[PDB]
Design a protein around this ligand. Structure first.
Ligand SMILES: O=C1NC[C@H](CO)[C@@H](O)[C@@H]1O
Length: 439
């Protein structure tokens, strides 16, 4: 039996563009994920977010599912272009209405709302002005955040500025695999910097407008291990500092980028980037870590490449390494000692099938989840201030450049009918929540 602290927060997480559909409904502006996925070749099978889980219409049934499961928290994001169709200026009341109904329903049902201000669907209108490459996005992002705070901060008390800013910067602007689909290393590192400035402006606005709430920021993380006791160990140190929370938490807590990031990337950062660091250290209330996989790494003349290992993998091909989530929780306490931590995403893609009995027998997902929750429990016993854990995802959804081909939900979605079928893993997680732990 592994029981968690009294009042520990069990949740599920989604993102607006992955589940909503109806991206241009009720006066919404286009986002960069709309234009990116409507460009041939960018997304597997030409899939887009036009329909997705149709959550834009089915939101009440989805929340009734969260309730029925006994889940105590719901992490969801707001589409910036639904709220401000040109990114700044005009506010769309029907966009506010859509989220106001979700927020009120959650509160009525006693589910704690965790709102992600930005989960990758930037207004297209702002991308035309350079998007995350433009220093002015710090102002645009502050104006957007202020609207949300003024409108929803009476009810939502837990906020997240950014989801996975490393991915937004590097996968969007260096690898070109995500919107807005660019390949320019100087743009990518300017986006890193501007994401930090915008995050800090939003926190500053939060302190004036929501005097009783808490605000944090969410990072993707991998557990990197070296391919030899040899350059190899440093390559691993590099990957942690670049790919994990330190790229952002070193600025936030210590006022400069991490050592090995500066070594690799100094030339790509704005010349006087240090001028902004005083403002970047704006105090945050919590750190959200996302976590999925482990990676064997070696030096390879970013002077790093991955080595495949004969470990169990998910449908993404991500090696399953549960001790990574213990490692990243311990490491964040050890390096920056944040006052609170949340695991804001943990989950797995498996090739789910509805059996003849009408059920989805995803023991593989149960096994994955159980092992990572066990490792999180361990971190708590050893003093990590972990306040909550969020499963990615409530629903199968639009998995970015993989489209609908990858299923992460604990609830199955039949896209031909939009029917939801709770999977074995969802039933299993519900029991974990009720018992406040494992057994
Ligand atoms: O925030 C996220 N991180 C990784 C998930 C699985 O790839 C993704 O679906 C989600 O948007």
């Amino acid at each position: 039996v592994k029981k968690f602290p009294e009042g520990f927060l069990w949740g599920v997480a989604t993102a607006s563009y992955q589940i909503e559909g109806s991206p241009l409904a009720d006066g919404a502006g286009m986002s960069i994920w709309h234009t990116f996925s409507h460009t041939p070749g960018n997304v597997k099978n030409g899939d887009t977010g036009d329909v997705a889980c149709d959550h834009y219409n089915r939101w009440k049934e989805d929340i009734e599912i969260i309730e029925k499961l006994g889940v105590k928290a719901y992490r969801f994001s707001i589409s910036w272009p639904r709220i401000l169709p040109e990114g700044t200026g005009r506010v769309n009341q029907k966009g506010l209405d859509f989220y106001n109904r979700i927020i009120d329903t959650l509160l009525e049902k006693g589910i704690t709302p965790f709102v992600t201000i930005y989960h990758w669907d930037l207004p297209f209108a702002l991308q035309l002005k350079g998007g995350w490459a433009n220093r002015e996005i710090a102002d645009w992002f502050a104006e957007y955040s202020r609207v949300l705070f003024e409108n929803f901060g009476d009810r939502v008390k837990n906020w997240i500025t950014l989801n996975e800013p490393w991915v937004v910067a590097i996968v969007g602007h260096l690898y070109g695999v995500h919107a807005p689909g660019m390949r320019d290393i100087y743009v990518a590192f300017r986006a890193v910097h501007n994401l930090l400035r915008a995050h800090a402006r939003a926190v500053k606005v939060f302190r004036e407008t929501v005097k009783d709430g808490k605000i944090g920021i969410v990072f993707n993380n991998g557990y990197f291990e070296p391919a030899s006791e040899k350059e190899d160990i440093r390559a691993v140190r590099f990957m942690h500092q670049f790919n994990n929370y330190p790229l952002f938490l070193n600025p936030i807590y210590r006022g400069d980028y991490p050592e090995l990031v500066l070594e690799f990337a100094r030339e790509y950062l704005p010349e006087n980037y240090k001028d902004d660091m005083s403002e970047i250290q704006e105090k945050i209330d919590f750190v959200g870590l996302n976590y999925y996989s482990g990676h064997l790494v070696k030096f390879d003349p970013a002077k790093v490449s991955f080595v495949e290992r004969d470990l169990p993998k998910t449908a993404m091909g991500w090696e399953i390494v549960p001790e990574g989530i213990y490692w990243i929780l311990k490491k964040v306490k050890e390096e920056y000692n944040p006052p609170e931590v949340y695991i804001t995403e943990n989950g797995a893609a498996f090739d789910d099938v509805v059996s003849e009995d009408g059920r989805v027998h995803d023991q593989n997902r149960i096994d994955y989840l159980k092992a990572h929750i066990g490792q999180a429990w361990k971190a708590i016993q050893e003093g990590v201030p972990l306040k909550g854990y969020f499963v990615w995802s409530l629903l199968d959804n639009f998995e970015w450049a993989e489209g609908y081909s990858k299923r992460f939900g604990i609830v199955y979605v039949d896209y031909s009918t939009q029917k939801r079928i709770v999977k074995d893993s969802g039933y299993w997680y519900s029991n974990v929540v009720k018992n406040n732990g494992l057994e």
